[PDB]
């Protein structure tokens, strides 16, 4: 079995997975909407009671499986729980990242496309008033994606958007096909320092921004001024637990698979904690210092609330580009912003497609070359649904990217700490540890962490599922049909894997 060559590469690869577009866009918006500086109280608590415990568990499960030559959850769950239902539940841990890949790599391709257009100056140039500046960029984005102008749920992406998607798939393949140490690990040691340099440059440049409407200082103010009255709202604690869960990328299978290339007795306690820490720093320090402070500096604190409510996507793909076209040398600034997002996405997508690569390698005994090419083939083909069918992206993001992962996160906890055995699980986590997990976490992992996730899942199921089922367009069944099919297809692959094993 392949192994991470160095401790540094392992940590940077894991952190690279966690550090994504959300760090620079989602987190700052969530913080502004849920109490500003006060948001850090439930955020740190969620980190302590949910994020860190689960992450250690996923590392442990992965390393445990890797020791027996298995990197994915259908086989790993079966090792922890010799039951047929464990294998089927394990399929979900292969389905979720596959479905996410089918839309996320496409979104990743947008950032590359925008970076190129900015670099060569193929961007709009307004003109006055905010709407006079934003609209040309809203249209620019919509023409890139091909947002429906009529009543049909049909997208019509530009030729450029389609070709950039191909190139983005090629870049992902180039890394993955070289493997863990020579591919993913090698790239992490280049990409993370590059990510850090781009962000710091952006932070510095943003802190120098001054407009008649305000300054960057105003932005940092609005974002970090605490509003403790929002702490009463249970949804703010839900938002924190949710933010933490997604920011660490728990429940996606990627962490377990990466850990399966960690040697049997190599530390995971300190390494895992370190990776999580980098993500948190990149999140609150770098992410919180760029997008929102820039927006408030240009439009004024008067529009701070409106900007925050417009969402993470509008902020990163419409608002900031518009601002950059109004600032000195902003065109090169725009390139750097989208270059930053692209590497943040790329380090996440190579991690997210590895579980499917690992499964074909470990369980169906495919060569790395074949496993990478077939995985890319499926993601590329399937993505045409996301490229041409409106709201298909959203449907996939909901079932797999939202409900699925929280459900799967809870499933990991229960199977590991309750079915497999908390004592066996506890020793599995701490073995080879540079530091030992605090004794208190035994109770957290067993009762607190699953309680939190159960609450999150129930609240989100009751809130969003009735809406999605009753108020959506009929074309959502096309996407539902397709991803249910993918789950059946994977169940079949798992079936062939156990049949092959019975023969040999």
Ligand X SMILES: CNCC[C@H](Oc1cccc2ccccc12)c1cccs1
Ligand Y SMILES: CCCCCCCCO[C@@H]1O[C@H](CO)[C@@H](O)[C@H](O)[C@H]1O
Contacts of 461 (CB under 8 A, 6+ apart): 403
Distance CA 396, CA 478 (A): 11
Q: Which option in ligand Y, ligand X, Na ion, none does residue 481 bind, with CB closer than 5 to 8 A by kind?
A: ligand Y
Distance CA 249, CA 497 (A): 27
Q: 390 or 430, CB closer to ligand Y? A: 390
Q: 254 or 413, CB closer to ligand X? A: 254
Residue 162 found at the interface with ligand Y (CB under 6 A):
yes
> Which of 196, 257, 261, 234 has its CA nearest to residue 58?
257
If binding means CB under 6 A, how many residues of this protein chain bind ligand Y?
Answer: 15
- Please indicate if the annotation marks 82 as binding a ligand: no
In the complex, least distance from residue 383 CB atom to ligand Y, rounded to whole angstroms:
11
Q: 65 or 97, CB closer to ligand X? A: 97
Q: 56 or 77, CB closer to Na ion? A: 56
Residue 151 found at the interface with ligand Y (CB under 6 A):
no
Interface residues with ligand X (CB under 6 A) are: 17-18, 20, 97, 100-101, 104-105, 246-249, 252, 254, 348-349, 352-353, 401
Question: Residues 47 to 86: which contact ligand Y by CB under 6 A?
Answer: none
Q: Which option in ligand Y, ligand X, Na ion, none does residue 470 bind, with CB closer than 5 to 8 A by kind?
A: ligand Y
Interface residues with Na ion (CB under 5 A) are: 16, 18-20, 23, 247, 279, 344, 347-348
> Which pair of tokens denotes residue 136?
């040309």
In the complex, least distance from residue 281 CB atom to ligand X, rounded to whole angstroms:
14
In the complex, least distance from residue 195 CB atom to Na ion, rounded to whole angstroms:
8
Length of the chain equals 504
> Which of 89, 75, 82 has its CA nearest to residue 412?
89
The residues that bridge with 210 in the sheet, in sequence order, are: 215
* Strand-strand pairing, 214-215 and 210-211: antiparallel
Nearest-Å Rg of the Cα atoms of the chain is: 22
Q: 134 or 180, CB closer to ligand X? A: 180
In the complex, least distance from residue 68 CB atom to ligand Y, rounded to whole angstroms:
39
- Single out the residue of 125, 151, 471, 504 in contact with ligand Y (rule: CB under 6 A): 471
Q: Of 152-160, 167-175, 212-220, 230-238, which segment contacts ligand Y by CB under 6 A?
A: 152-160
In a 13 Å sphere around the CA of 219, the CA atoms on its Cβ side amount to: 28
> Which pair of tokens denotes residue 41?
């109280």
Q: 212 or 481, CB closer to ligand Y? A: 481
Question: Residues 474 to 503: which contact ligand Y by CB under 6 A?
Answer: 474, 476-478, 481
Q: Which option in ligand X, Na ion, ligand Y, none does residue 158 bind, with CB closer than 5 to 8 A by kind?
A: ligand Y
CB neighbourhood size of 115 (10 A): 21
Cα distances from 395 to residues 20, 102, 154, 221, in angstroms, run: 21, 12, 15, 36
Q: Breaks in the chain at C–N > 2.5 Å: after which residues? A: 127
> Which pair of tokens denotes residue 249?
């990328």
In the complex, least distance from residue 254 CB atom to ligand X, rounded to whole angstroms:
5
Residue 158 found at the interface with ligand Y (CB under 6 A):
yes
Q: Which option in Na ion, ligand X, ligand Y, none does residue 162 bind, with CB closer than 5 to 8 A by kind?
A: ligand Y
Distance CA 184, CA 84 (A): 33
Q: 374 or 388, CB closer to ligand Y? A: 388
Q: Which option in ligand Y, ligand X, Na ion, none does residue 347 bind, with CB closer than 5 to 8 A by kind?
A: Na ion
Contacts of 445 (CB under 8 A, 6+ apart): 53, 56, 57, 413, 417, 422, 425
Cα distances from 464 to residues 168, 247, 394, 402, 475, in angstroms, run: 32, 20, 13, 10, 18
Q: 257 or 331, CB closer to ligand X? A: 257
Residue 156 found at the interface with ligand Y (CB under 6 A):
yes
In the complex, least distance from residue 421 CB atom to ligand Y, rounded to whole angstroms:
41
Distance CA 65, CA 70 (A): 5
CB neighbourhood size of 233 (10 A): 12
In the complex, least distance from residue 33 CB atom to Na ion, rounded to whole angstroms:
17
Q: Give the annotated binding-site residues for phosphocholine.
A: 84
Kindly list the residues in this chain that would bind ligand Y in the complex (CB under 6 A): 146, 156-159, 162, 469-472, 474, 476-478, 481
Residue list, annotated binding site: 84
């Amino acid at each position: 079995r392949e192994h991470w060559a160095t401790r540094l590469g392992l940590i940077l690869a894991m952190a690279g997975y966690a550090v994504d577009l959300g760090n620079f866009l989602r987190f700052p918006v969530q913080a502004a909407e849920n109490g500003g500086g006060a948001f850090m109280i439930p955020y740190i608590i969620a980190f302590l009671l949910v994020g860190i415990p689960l992450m250690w568990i996923e590392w442990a499960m992965g390393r445990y499986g890797g020791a027996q030559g298995h990197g994915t959850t259908p086989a790993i769950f079966y090792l922890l729980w010799r039951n047929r239902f464990a294998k089927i539940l394990g399929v979900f841990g292969l389905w979720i990242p596959l479905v996410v890949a089918i839309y996320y790599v496409y979104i990743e391709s947008w950032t590359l496309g925008f970076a190129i257009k900015f670099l060569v100056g193929l961007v709009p140039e307004p003109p006055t008033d905010p709407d006079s500046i934003l609209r040309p960029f809203k249209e620019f984005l919509y023409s890139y994606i091909g947002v429906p102008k009529g009543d049909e749920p049909i997208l019509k992406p530009s030729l450029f958007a389609y070709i950039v998607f191909l190139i983005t798939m090629f870049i992902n393949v180039s890394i993955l096909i070289r493997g863990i140490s020579k591919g993913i690990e090698r790239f992490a040691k280049i990409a993370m320092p590059t990510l850090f340099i781009l962000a710091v440059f952006l932070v510095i440049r943003v802190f120098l921004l001054e407009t008649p409407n305000g300054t960057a200082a105003d932005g940092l103010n609005f974002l970090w001024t605490p509003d403790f009255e929002k702490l009463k709202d249970p949804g703010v604690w839900i938002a924190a637990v949710g933010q933490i869960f997604f920011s660490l990328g728990l429940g996606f299978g990627a962490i377990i698979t990466f850990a399966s290339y960690v040697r049997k007795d190599q530390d995971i306690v300190l390494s895992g904690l370190t990776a999580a820490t980098l993500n948190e720093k990149a999140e609150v320090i770098l992410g919180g210092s760029i997008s929102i402070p820039a927006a408030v500096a240009f439009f004024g604190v008067a529009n701070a609330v409106a900007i925050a409510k417009a969402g993470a996507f509008n902020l990163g793909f419409i608002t900031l580009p518009a601002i950059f076209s109004q600032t000195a040398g902003g065109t090169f600034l725009g390139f750097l912003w989208f270059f930053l997002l692209f590497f943040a996405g790329l380090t996440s997508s190579i991690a997210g497609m590895q579980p499917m690569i690992a499964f074909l390698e470990d369980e169906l005994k495919l060569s790395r070359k074949h496993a990478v090419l077939w995985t890319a083939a499926i993601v590329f083909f399937s993505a045409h649904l996301v490229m041409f069918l409106n709201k298909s992206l959203d449907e996939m993001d909901f079932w797999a990217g939202t409900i699925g992962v929280v459900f799967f996160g809870l499933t990991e906890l229960i199977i590991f700490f309750w079915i497999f055995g908390a004592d066996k699980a506890w020793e599995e986590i701490n073995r080879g540890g540079i530091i030992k997990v605090p004794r208190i976490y035994y109770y957290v992992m067993r009762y607190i962490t699953p309680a939190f996730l159960a609450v999150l899942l129930v609240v989100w199921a009751r809130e969003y599922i009735p809406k999605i089922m009753e108020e959506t367009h009929w074309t959502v069944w096309i996407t539902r049909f397709y991803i249910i099919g993918l789950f059946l297809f994977l169940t079949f692959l798992v079936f062939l894997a156990e049949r092959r094993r019975n023969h040999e």
